[PDB]
């Protein structure tokens, strides 16, 4: 299908690669700031009756990375039959352990074909040490803070499916506001800042009854193959309870998920983005 790849060209270090629940929390804070309360409810009603966003994924110089589907670990004997047993063991061990794939290798992994891993991940989790100084006696107090430091041409992006007037009215004004404020982390240290470019991605996904999620989904029925992701963030100082997401790459079957509202004692109601970004996939016998 034809999507809209919203590239994020970083102006500093991130705190984590963003996810779909903390992009919709960031977009909803943007629309509540530049439009108001009456447009956030129109925004939540647009993801229910229409299409949705995916998680954020890295890239490196027009090489768009996408997560490895979980459809290939039971297949992994049949994927690599044409390789000799002196290296077929360790080929499948680095292939089961992998996290991202290229845009060509993702389209091969959807069809259960032999594919390869990338050699260079576009970022690093570095530990920059900070300090806390007394204002009178200059007394140090070291603590450790971790960042995501990208490379020269690299960054992060997410995908969008849906109608265009929802994008051009809500998501496209939100990403220009969210480029000058941050996406998570210590944004007062200039962390979560970026520039934005809107492009066109086309993915060859086969047609089947199964599909893979490219976002955190919060499923309603039980999915087929999944990978649990137990998180829950913060909301205007109030804490969200931890919730059982599934990570991107998990396999669902005719499952749309659902955005769950929360109370938290605020004036408004807080929605947690529980929608899925489906692309078709081929499975083995279970």
């Amino acid at each position: 299908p034809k999507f809209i790849a919203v590239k994020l060209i970083p102006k500093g270090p991130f705190r984590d690669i963003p996810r779909a629940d903390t992009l919709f929390g960031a977009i909803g804070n943007a629309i509540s700031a530049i439009h108001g309360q009456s447009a956030v409810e129109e925004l939540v009603d647009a993801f229910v009756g229409g299409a949705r966003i995916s998680s954020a994924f890295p890239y490196s110089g027009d090489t768009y990375y996408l997560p490895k589907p979980l459809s290939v670990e039971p297949a992994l004997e049949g994927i690599l039959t044409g390789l000799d047993e002196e290296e077929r063991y360790t080929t499948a061990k680095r292939l089961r352990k992998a996290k991202y794939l290229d845009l060509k290798n993702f389209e091969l992994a959807l069809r259960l074909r032999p594919f390869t891993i990338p050699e260079e991940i576009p970022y690093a989790r570095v530990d920059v040490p900070r300090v806390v100084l007394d204002r009178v006696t200059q007394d140090s107090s070291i603590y450790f803070w971790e960042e995501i430091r990208f490379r020269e041409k690299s960054g992060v992006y997410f995908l969008y499916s849906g109608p265009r007037e929802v994008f051009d009215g809500y998501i496209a004004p939100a990403m220009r506001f969210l480029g000058d404020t941050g996406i998570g982390g210590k944004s007062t240290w200039g962390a979560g800042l970026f520039e934005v470019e809107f492009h066109e991605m086309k993915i060859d996904a086969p047609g089947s009854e199964y599909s893979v999620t490219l976002s955190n989904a919060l499923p309603t029925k039980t999915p087929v193959l999944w990978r649990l992701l137990r998180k829950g963030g913060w909301s205007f100082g109030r804490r969200k309870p931890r919730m059982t997401f599934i990570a991107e790459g998990s396999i669902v079957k005719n499952d749309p998920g659902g955005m769950e509202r929360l109370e938290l004692g605020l004036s408004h109601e807080v929605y947690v983005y529980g929608l899925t970004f489906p692309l078709g996939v081929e499975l083995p016998e279970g």
Binding site: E73, T90, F144, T222, L225, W226, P241, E263, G286
Partner: protein, 771 residues
């Protein structure tokens, strides 16, 4: 009972082999094995050794002919003195006879146990006492009859003072008959214990399955799925233990590994004491991964699904989707254990079962039914140590600082962390008893201290095979664990801030993590359950038992000389967080972690016969970095030295050019050759440099800046003449002579310069002088 007499039948039937190698009677050891048990029943014994001499006399098919020579001896030897029947005692001999062939699938010499890693190298006979003796597979020597005469003498002493019971005779046979070969042939690598531990496993699982003497005589028990291979693995161990914040300085984090192993034994012993099995049915239990041969009855399949249900639903309540236990089973038959034709059938049934462990870890908590359903729960907070979401009101003040509100399952581990010196194991009893610190999925564990009487129906004792002060109606489960730790001037475990203040040089923490490589391919060469049980204890005993005997400073000629900064002390400040399975995780002072990485791996090169290797990751950190970050880096650095030529040990965080030619991990034989040349010219011993180089470190510190011009681009040759000038005016033309000129052959071989591989010999010696 026929149940306790079948398990003690196959376990005590191949005894009589070590008295044949010693020569106490006329041969054909089925004859001598009868006259060894029957001799034991006379002097200080009961009349059940009189009947257990039937199992050691009617196998190898040399007496069971015409179905009437068995009756004439079992008629006068009366089973009526115990409760057995003429039909029943004759039924159990056919079960032990068939189980002898299902564990082997196959003379008159005296030939040692050959090594399971090299069949051309053999073990000398030793004791399994984990002191002073690393059995290195050396040259094949025929073991003398004077050594088997002393084997039987120590065994005769121990069988008399031990209760005739399956949990008491298994640690007796594991001490003495570990390094004795089962069948004396050329290149036989099956131990005698592991052939008796796995004959009594198959024999009891045939009795529980319901097959009788005509199901053995007609071959009905083979080619029919009457067996069942249980296999279970914990998933999430790296996220379970090390993912804790900057609290619990190495007493808590060492008690996380001891409490996870208690969860492992609380599921394994729950299967055995509920399907009717013994501990011989455990094929192995090594590193959160176990394997049990059981029976294929619908009463057992119905009960394993209830053990799997209660264990998973316990784990989700306690550990909020941080740790999962996938348990699977695959029905196999009698022909499935042995190699048929040329196609291995036991490795095929192990790959059918390993595929069911893979597809179940991708469905991580499916048997919960409240997993993906939300629920409004109010007023929750997190533990400051491990970060688990608990409803507050269940939080409570700790014992370190009463302001920190920690969860109750981490005040039980700080207390348990303080008792690890004063602990000889655990006692496994019911949940609602007194004295229970920690609770498993099925049973609560009490601390069995140094002095006192234990409580519990099953008493786990650590690092010994001797039931010292255990009651005679309790079950003895011996388990091994690498328990070396540095102590403070008090009795407890040392600290991250106390280990790193005795390092000869700058202050860093030394964290190593390493595992055996391509080991699952080695376990596919096993084609019988006894050969799997032999290969999976010897690799397990290296990390359980033969890693404390390295840090104690033994193995002098076998290890030899290693890259050492200071000489190896009597008290190394080294803490073994975990060792077991195939991996270890060891923290300590960074100047003795570095030596021990080349001292463990040299000892692993001689433990196996050179055919298996290690691969070690290494990092050097700050004390105040939390251990969830000092584990995620070294695990990345362990994998960095593993997606390469695989024999490689990472040493230090090194910068390298972005061309793809350069690799971050030294190979083991490469770096050890680079120590024999480069160290006796710039280093003398115990933290000090050589002569004519004292207080001349401005050479060596700026020498790395010469190497950093090579890291930016190897296309420049500017490092070649800058090396020759800085060595020139100091008069050091002899020191480092192959660093001034480029290597013409190396570019033809497409390999890096010798200025690239000189960083990790300089940078270790630089920071191990005061820095």
């Amino acid at each position: 009972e026929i149940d306790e007499l079948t398990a003690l039948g196959g376990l005590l039937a191949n005894i009589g082999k070590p008295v044949q190698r010693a020569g106490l009677y006329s041969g054909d050891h089925s004859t001598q094995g009868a006259r060894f048990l029957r001799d034991l029943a006379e002097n200080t014994g009961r009349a059940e050794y009189e009947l257990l001499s039937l199992f050691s006399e009617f196998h190898h098919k040399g007496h069971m002919k015409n179905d009437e020579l068995m009756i004439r001896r079992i008629k006068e030897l009366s089973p009526e003195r115990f409760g057995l029947t003429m039909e029943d005692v004759l039924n159990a001999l056919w079960i032990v006879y068939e189980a002898d062939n299902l564990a082997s699938g196959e003379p008159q010499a005296s030939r040692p146990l050959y090594s399971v890693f090299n069949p051309g190298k053999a073990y000398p006979w030793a004791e399994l006492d984990f002191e002073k003796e690393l059995p290195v597979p050396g040259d094949v020597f025929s073991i003398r009859s004077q050594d088997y005469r002393e084997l039987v003498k120590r065994l005769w002493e121990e069988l008399s003072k031990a209760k005739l019971r399956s949990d008491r005779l298994l640690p007796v046979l594991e001490k003495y008959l570990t390094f004795v070969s089962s069948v004396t042939s050329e290149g036989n690598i099956i131990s005698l214990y592991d052939h008796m531990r796995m004959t009594s496993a198959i024999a009891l699982a045939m009795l529980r399955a319901g097959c009788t003497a005509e199901d053995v005589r007609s071959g009905r028990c083979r080619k029919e799925k009457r067996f069942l291979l249980i296999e279970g693995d914990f998933s999430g161990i790296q996220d379970f233990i090390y993912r804790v914040s900057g609290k619990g300085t190495l007493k808590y984090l060492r008690a996380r590994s001891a409490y996870l192993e208690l969860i492992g034994w609380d599921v394994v012993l729950e299967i055995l004491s509920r399907l009717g099995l013994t501990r011989a049915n455990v094929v192995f239990n090594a590193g959160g991964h176990f394997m049990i041969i059981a029976q294929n009855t619908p009463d057992a399949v119905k009960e394993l699904e209830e053990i799997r249900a209660k264990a998973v639903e316990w784990l989700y309540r306690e550990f909020e989707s941080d740790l999962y236990l996938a348990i699977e089973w695959e029905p196999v038959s009698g022909r499935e254990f042995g190699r048929e034709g040329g196609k291995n059938l036991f490795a095929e049934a192990r790959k059918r079962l390993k595929h069911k462990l893979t597809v179940r870890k991708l469905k991580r908590f499916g048997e919960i039914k409240g997993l993906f359903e939300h629920g409004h729960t109010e007023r929750l907070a997190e533990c400051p140590v491990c970060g688990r979401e608990l409803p507050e009101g269940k939080l409570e003040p700790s014992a370190s600082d009463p302001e920190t509100k920690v969860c109750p399952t981490c005040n039980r581990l700080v207390s348990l962390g303080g008792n690890l010196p004063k602990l000889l194991g655990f006692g496994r009893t019911a949940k609602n008893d007194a004295g229970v610190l920690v609770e498993g999925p099925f049973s609560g564990f009490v601390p069995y201290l140094q002095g006192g009487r234990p409580v519990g129906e099953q008493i786990l004792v650590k690092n010994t095979l001797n039931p010292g002060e255990i009651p005679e109606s309790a079950q003895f489960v011996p388990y091994f664990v690498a328990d070396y730790f540095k102590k403070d001037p008090k009795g407890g475990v040392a600290t991250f801030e106390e280990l790193s203040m005795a390092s000869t040089g700058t202050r860093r923490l030394g964290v190593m993590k390493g595992d055996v490589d391509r080991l699952g391919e080695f376990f596919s060469s096993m084609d019988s359950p006894s050969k799997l049980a032999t290969a999976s204890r010897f690799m397990d005993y290296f990390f359980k038992g033969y890693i404390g005997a390295i840090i104690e400073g033994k193995f002098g000629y076998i290890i030899g000389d290693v890259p050492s900064l200071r000489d190896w002390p009597e008290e190394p400040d080294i803490v073994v967080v975990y060792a077991g399975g195939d991996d270890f995780f060891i923290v300590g002072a960074w100047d003795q972690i570095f030596e021990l990485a080349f001292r463990v791996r040299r000892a692993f090169n001689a433990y196996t016969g050179g055919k298996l290797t290690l691969s070690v990751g290494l990092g050097y950190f700050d004390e105040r970095t939390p251990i969830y970050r000092m584990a995620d880096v070294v695990s990345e650095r362990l994998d960095t030295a593993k997606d390469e030529g695989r024999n490689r040990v990472f040493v230090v965080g090194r910068s390298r050019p972005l061309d793809g030619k350069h690799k971050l991990s030294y190979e083991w034989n490469h770096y050890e050759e680079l120590w024999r040349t480069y160290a006796p010219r710039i280093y003398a011993g115990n933290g000090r440099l050589k002569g004519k180089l004292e207080s001349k470190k401005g050479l060596l510190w700026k020498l790395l800046e010469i190497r950093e011009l090579y890291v930016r681009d190897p296309n420049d040759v500017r490092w070649a003449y800058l090396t020759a000038y800085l060595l020139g005016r100091h008069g050091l033309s002899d020191l480092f002579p192959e660093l001034v000129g480029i290597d013409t052959k190396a570019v033809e071989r497409k390999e890096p310069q010798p200025v690239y591989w000189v960083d990790g010999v300089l940078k270790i010696v630089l920071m191990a002088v005061r820095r």
